[PDB]
Design a binder for this molecule. Sequence first.
Ligand SMILES: CCOC(=O)c1c(-c2ccccc2)oc2ccc(O)c(CN3CCCC3)c12
Length: 268
Amino acid sequence: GFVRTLRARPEAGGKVPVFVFHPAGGSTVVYEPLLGRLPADTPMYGFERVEGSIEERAQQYVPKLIEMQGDGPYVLVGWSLGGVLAYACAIGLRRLGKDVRFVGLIDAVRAGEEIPQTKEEIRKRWDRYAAFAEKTFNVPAIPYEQLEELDDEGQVRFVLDAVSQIPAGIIEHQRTSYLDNRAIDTAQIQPYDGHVTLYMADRYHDDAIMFEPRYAVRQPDGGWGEYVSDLEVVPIGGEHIQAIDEPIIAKVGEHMSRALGQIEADRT
Ligand SMILES: CCOC(=O)c1c(-c2ccccc2)oc2ccc(O)c(CN3CCCC3)c12
């Protein structure tokens, strides 16, 4: 289904599992280096891509989380889109009376300026995209009227259909990566009253900034302060793309290992 077992929990008992959520355009295999930097016998399960708005995705994840972990305690972690997903699940779990003890955002940083969801923005985005298409491929008027009334999924299907009028593996990977990135853009963040740990790199990587220049700037709280009063930021430096890998992930893992140790002691 959509649950990957990175490290299975014992048949009974054992430590609290870490649930990780996939990043934009990738799977949860990317959390293996993190897993290497967490305490021994820490179980880990990864939740992979599902369809819908952030809230719709969480509506699919949360029942599964509960089936696997019951009342809690819940440790929810994510890099890239995975961060927003972990957070949405945190809100859903807390609303149903569950015990969420840790939410780990791994450089899941909001654009430094809000990205509006307006028809003007739709037009600016696709104008930007058309221009790069011209330059990258050495190659007309953009049918804005039809695009404005399509959602993101509809917009890319329209552009891809108009394009064919490229092999499927490549189209599918560009498609889901594009939609997962837009899901980050259009996420409507709700407030959460539990503790959030935000691991913060210095900047988005250049390719990220080229697609959406508002990611060139980040606030110090990464845009989460207004939604999260109990917010901790753990600066890790480097770029967004590097935050998930060795050696920077060692810094994340060392800190996160301390948090897990406290959760384990409290149960004891
Ligand atoms: C090379 C990295 O490309 C992307 O980040 C994005 C992609 C993408 C497309 C095809 C293949 C891979 C990625 O689509 C986007 C749509 C909106 C948007 O704001 C972003 C920018 N990101 C950066 C921070 C979150 C949004 C992207």
